[PDB]
Design a protein around this ligand. Structure first.
Ligand SMILES: Cc1cc2nc3c(=O)[nH]c(=O)nc-3n(C[C@H](O)[C@H](O)[C@H](O)COP(=O)(O)OP(=O)(O)OC[C@H]3O[C@@H](n4cnc5c(N)ncnc54)[C@H](O)[C@@H]3O)c2cc1C
Ligand SMILES: Cc1cc2nc3c(=O)[nH]c(=O)nc-3n(C[C@H](O)[C@H](O)[C@H](O)COP(=O)(O)OP(=O)(O)OC[C@H]3O[C@@H](n4cnc5c(N)ncnc54)[C@H](O)[C@@H]3O)c2cc1C
Ligand SMILES: [Cl-]
Ligand SMILES: [Cl-]
Lengths: 517, 517
C-alpha cells in the first residue's frame, strides 16, 4: 500500500499545533503536513493546568526540555490539585481542604501505605491520609517550589500556563520544521460516495486534499461530527456541569505568594478552578446550567474573588462526552473535536497528546485498514471513559447536601459498572491498582501509565479527602505486626522528608522569579 | 410609629442565646421573640475566657448572680492573662512571663503608680512593673483563688467556661421566659425591593417573618453578609493570624493545681491559649497560615502539651475584621456574624453583650430611623477597632525576631493613626487614660467603661511586659519629691497586701472544689 504522505490538520488551537508538531516529529520522512486555522474563530486558552506526562510523552518526544518551553509560555509549577469545601457544606470556621498529589504512594511488604494509614486511623490516628502518606502537602501549604533553588527536583510536578502561548510556541516550532500553515476558514467538506473525506473548500476559495485529515476544529467537530456525522455520546447523565464563567485575576505574588497547585473550590452549583501563574491566576466557575443561571454563576464568581461588575468575563459552554468513534474513515479527531471532560482533574491536554501517541502507534497507510482505527478507537474510549469515571467519583462520593446540585450528584448520576466495581473494592478495604515503580519509572513508561492511569493513591486522595473511607483495614494486616512496624518507619521517613522540605525549598514565587521574572 | 413586636434571632450559639435572653429581659412588654438554630450546624465553644463586665453588664441585667450561673457552666476563676515567651525568643533557661491584670492601678497625686515605678526603674529598681503596681500577681504565681474561703472578693476576676454550657444555660433561662425556640435551618432569605429582610425560608418549609432580625448565624453572616451583602472589612493587613488548632487537655488539678488565669504562650507562628477549668484546660494554637501550615501548627500544639497523634483536634479558621456596618435595614448582627478578633484579650463574648447593651440603648421602632442604626454602628466600629488596636499593640511592640512571623509583626503591620498616637504618648512618658474610680465603680459604670475600655494600666502591663518602656519618667516628678515619697508608701501597702494574700487565700483548686467538685 501507498504511504499516507499528505496530511491536513484543521485547527490551530492547542490540539492542532500539538498534532502538527507530534506528527512532523514522528513522521521523519514522506510527510507533507498542512495546518489550516481560521483567524475569525477563537482558540480555547483559559489558563490551563496539566499533568507530568506532558513532558514525558509530549515535549520529550519533540526533544524539547522543560527549561526550553516553560519560559516561553510563562509557565508556573503545579504539584497537586487542592480541593476546597468539597467534603462538607462550607463553614467559614472550618478548614475543608485536601490534596490530590502527583506521584504514587510507596508499598510496604506488598501493601500501599494508604492501607497502613487506615489501620492507624481505626485506632485513633488523627492525621489526614495524604499528610501521612506523602512528603509534600505541607510544603504546598507553605507555597514552596517543587525544586531546590539549584533545580534539583524534590517532588513530582506539572505546569500551569496560558494554552494560547503553548499553541504559539508549537506553531513556531512546527512551522520551522516544515509544517505548512494556512490562515483561512473551511466552509465546506466534500465526501466521496463511500463517505471518506475528499476535500475541504475554504472561504478564500482553496480546495484542500489529503491522504489523512486531523480534525482539530474544537467542539464543533467540523469534520468528524458535522461532515462525517459521527454521533456524539452526550454524557450529561454521568456529569451535570455544562458551563463555565472564567477570567484572570491579578495576584500580588510578592505579598501573597504563588500557590504551587491548582485549586478546585466547590460552589453551590459547580466548582471554581484556580490556576496560579506569575502576576495572576486563571479562574473559572464550572457550573451546571440546570442548577444555576449563568447570571447567578457570574455573580458568585465575582463575589468569590471580590471582582467588580466591570471585569470582562469569558462565558463558556460545553457538552460532556465523546464521539462514538474518534477516527472514522480518513479523519482522526484530536482535542475538543473528539471529547470533553470538565477540567476537574486536568485531563484536557492529556487527551490531546495521549491520542497523538496512540495515532502514531496505529498509524495507517492509504488503505485505511479498519483494524488499526478500531484499535485506536478502543484506546480512546478506554482513556476517556476511565477519566470520566474518576472525575465522576469526586461528585457522587461527596456528602455535601446543601444544594440541589450536590444532592443530584449524590443520588441522580448514572454510574458505570467499572466505577461501581472500583468503589466496591475500595470500600471492602482492597488496594486499587498499585505500581512497584518509582515515580520516574512510572512517568517514563507510557504504555503502562496510559492503561493504569489512576492508581490506588489517586483514588485514596479523592475518597479519603471526601471523608469516604473503607469499611475496614485489610484483614491480612492482623497477621503481620512486623509489616505494620516497617510501615511506621516509612511514615517516619516521610515526616522527616516533609520537615527537610519545609526548610530547604525556596518559595514557589522566589523560584519562579529566579527562572526569570 | 408602631413598636417592633416580633423579633427573630438566627443562631443558637453564645450570641443567639445572649441576644434572646438580653432582649426578653429588656423588652418587658410588646415583644415576641423567636430563635431559630440548626441542629446540623455547630456552635463555637472552645473553652472560653472572659472579662469582669460579663457579670456587671450581662448577668446582672438578667438578675442572675455569679453563684447561680457559674456552677451551671462548670466555670473556673480568671484573674489575668499571663503572657509567656512574648518578650524574647524562647530560652528554656529564662523565665519570660508577665501578667495583664484586671482592675486598675491607683494614682498618687494625680499620677498613676506605673509612672512612679518607671522613675524608680530609671534609678536601678529591678522589680517588674506589675509586681510593684498590683497586689495579686505573686498570688497568681501561687495558683491562689481570687476570694477568701468565705467568698470575700480579694481581687478583680472573671471566668473560664465551656461556652456551649453557657448557651445551654441561657437557652433554658430564655425559653422559660417565653422565647420561642425553633430547631430548623434557614435556607433562603427574601428581601423586598427596598432591601429589607421580608422573610426566612427554612429547610422544614417554614416561612419566618419579623419586625426585626438579629443575625447570630456565626462567621457566615447568613443575613448581614450573605443576604444583605454588607461588605466585610478584612483586617488581615492589621493582624496576621487566621487559624487555630484546639483541644482540651486533662489536668491533674490535685497535683498541679488550677491556674487562676488564662495563659498566652507565644509560638513560632502565633500563640497558644490555655484556659484552665476543673479537670482540664482548653488550649488552642492560634496561628497564621501564611507562616505555618495547619499540619505544622498541629505538630507544635501536640508537642507543647505532650499530646499524642490520637488526640482529636478542633481545626478552626477565621477572618479578622468586621462588617462595614453591624446593623443594616432591619437586621442587627451580633457575635461572629458581626466581627472577629483573635482571643488574645478575651473580647469575643464581650463584643456580644456590649453590642446587645448598645442595641437596647438604640432600640428602633418599625420605621427604622437610620439615625439610631447609624449611632449604634459607630459605637460598634469604635468598640471593635479599639480592641483590634490594643491586641495589635501586643504584636508590633514585641522584640522577638526569631521567626518570619515575629519579624512581620514587628515590621509589616498596618497601624491605625489612633494606636500610633497612643504609643507616641506612652513613649513620651505620658499617662494614657486613667480612672479615679475604684475597680467596683469602674466595672459598674458601663457607659464609662465602654468608651474607656483600655486604660493606662492595661497598656502598661502589655508594653512593660514586652520590655518596651517610655523614654523617660514624667518631668513633673522632678518637681514633686513629696509625691514620690507618698507613692513609696503606696508601693509598701501593695507589698503588704501581696504578702497577706499569700497566706490568706485558698488555692484556686481548693476553692473551686469547695464551691462544688
Ligand atoms: C472551560 C475549559 C477549561 C479547561 N481547562 C483545562 C485544563 O485546566 N487543563 C487542560 O489540560 N485542558 C483544559 N481544557 C481543554 C483545553 O483548553 C483545550 O482542549 C485545548 O486548549 C485545545 O482545544 P482544541 O485545540 O481542540 O480546540 P480550540 O481551542 O477550540 O481551537 C479550535 C481551532 O480550530 C479552528 N477552527 C474551527 N473551525 C474552523 C474552520 N471551519 N476552518 C478553519 N479553522 C477552524 C479555530 O480557529 C481554532 O484554531 C479546558 C477546556 C475548557 C473548555
Ligand atoms: C478560636 C476561637 C477562640 C475564641 N476564644 C474566646 C475567648 O477566649 N473568650 C471569648 O469571650 N470569646 C472567644 N471566642 C468567641 C466565641 O467563641 C464566640 O463568639 C461565641 O462563643 C459565639 O459565636 P456566635 O454565637 O456568633 O456563632 P456560633 O457559635 O458559630 O453559632 C452560630 C449559630 O448559628 C446557627 N446557624 C448558622 N447558620 C444557620 C442557618 N442557616 N439556619 C439556622 N441556624 C444557623 C448555628 O447552628 C449556631 O447555632 C473565640 C472564638 C474562636 C473562633
Ligand atoms: Cl482538563
Ligand atoms: Cl476572644
Amino acid at each position: 500500500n501507498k504511504p499516507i504522505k499528505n496530511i491536513v490538520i484543521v485547527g490551530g488551537g492547542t490540539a492542532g499545533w500539538m498534532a502538527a508538531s507530534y506528527l512532523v516529529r514522528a513522521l521523519q520522512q514522506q510527510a507533507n503536513i498542512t495546518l489550516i486555522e481560521s483567524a475569525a474563530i477563537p482558540r480555547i486558552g483559559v489558563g490551563e493546568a496539566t499533568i507530568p506526562s506532558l513532558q514525558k510523552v509530549f515535549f520529550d518526544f519533540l526533544g524539547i526540555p522543560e527549561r526550553e518551553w516553560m519560559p516561553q509560555v510563562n509557565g508556573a509549577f503545579k504539584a497537586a490539585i487542592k480541593f476546597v469545601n468539597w467534603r462538607k457544606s462550607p463553614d467559614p470556621s472550618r478548614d475543608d481542604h485536601f490534596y490530590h498529589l502527583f506521584g504514587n504512594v510507596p508499598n510496604c511488604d506488598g501493601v500501599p501505605l494508604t492501607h497502613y494509614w487506615l489501620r492507624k486511623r481505626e485506632q485513633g490516628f488523627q492525621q489526614p491520609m495524604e499528610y501521612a502518606c506523602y512528603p509534600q502537602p505541607g510544603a504546598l501549604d507553605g507555597k514552596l517550589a517543587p525544586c531546590l533553588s539549584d533545580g534539583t527536583r524534590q517532588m513530582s510536578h506539572a505546569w500551569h500556563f496560558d494554552a494560547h502561548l503553548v499553541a504559539d510556541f508549537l506553531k513556531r516550532w512546527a512551522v520551522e520544521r516544515g509544517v505548512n500553515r494556512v490562515v483561512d476558514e473551511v466552509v465546506d467538506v466534500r465526501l466521496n460516495n463511500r463517505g471518506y473525506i475528499s476535500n475541504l473548500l475554504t472561504k478564500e476559495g482553496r480546495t484542500l486534499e489529503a491522504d489523512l485529515f486531523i480534525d482539530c476544529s474544537g467542539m464543533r467537530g467540523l469534520l468528524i461530527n458535522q461532515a462525517l456525522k459521527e454521533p456524539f455520546i452526550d454524557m450529561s447523565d454521568y456529569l451535570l456541569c455544562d458551563s463555565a464563567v472564567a477570567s484572570a485575576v491579578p495576584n500580588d505574588d510578592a505579598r501573597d505568594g504563588v500557590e504551587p497547585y491548582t485549586s478546585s473550590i466547590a460552589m453551590n452549583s459547580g466548582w471554581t478552578w484556580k490556576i496560579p501563574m506569575l502576576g495572576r491566576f486563571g479562574s473559572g466557575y464550572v457550573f451546571s446550567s440546570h442548577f444555576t443561571s449563568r447570571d447567578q454563576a457570574t455573580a458568585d464568581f465575582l463575589k468569590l474573588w471580590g471582582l467588580s461588575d466591570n471585569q470582562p468575563l469569558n462565558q463558556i459552554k460545553f457538552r460532556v462526552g465523546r464521539n462514538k468513534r474518534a477516527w472514522v474513515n480518513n479523519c482522526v479527531s484530536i482535542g475538543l473535536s473528539s471529547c470533553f471532560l470538565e477540567p476537574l482533574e486536568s485531563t484536557g491536554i492529556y487527551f490531546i497528546y495521549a491520542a497523538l501517541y496512540q495515532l502514531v502507534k496505529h498509524f495507517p497507510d492509504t488503505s485505511f485498514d479498519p483494524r488499526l482505527s478500531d484499535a485506536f478507537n478502543a484506546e480512546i474510549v478506554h482513556m476517556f471513559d476511565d477519566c470520566r469515571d474518576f472525575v465522576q467519583a469526586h461528585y457522587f462520593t461527596t456528602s455535601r447536601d446543601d444544594t440541589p446540585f450536590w444532592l443530584a450528584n449524590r443520588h441522580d448520576l448514572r454510574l458505570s459498572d467499572a466505577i461501581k466495581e472500583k468503589v466496591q473494592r475500595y470500600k471492602a478495604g482492597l488496594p486499587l491498582t498499585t505500581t512497584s515503580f518509582d515515580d520516574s519509572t512510572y512517568y517514563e513508561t507510557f504504555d503502562y501509565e496510559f492503561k493504569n492511569f489512576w492508581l490506588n493513591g489517586n483514588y485514596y486522595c479523592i475518597f479519603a479527602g471526601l471523608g469516604m473511607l473503607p469499611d475496614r483495614s485489610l484483614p491480612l494486616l492482623q497477621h503481620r505486626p512486623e509489616s505494620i512496624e516497617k510501615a511506621e518507619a516509612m511514615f517516619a521517613s516521610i515526616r522527616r522528608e516533609a520537615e527537610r522540605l519545609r526548610t530547604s525549598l525556596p518559595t514557589n514565587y522566589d523560584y519562579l522569579r529566579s527562572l526569570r521574572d
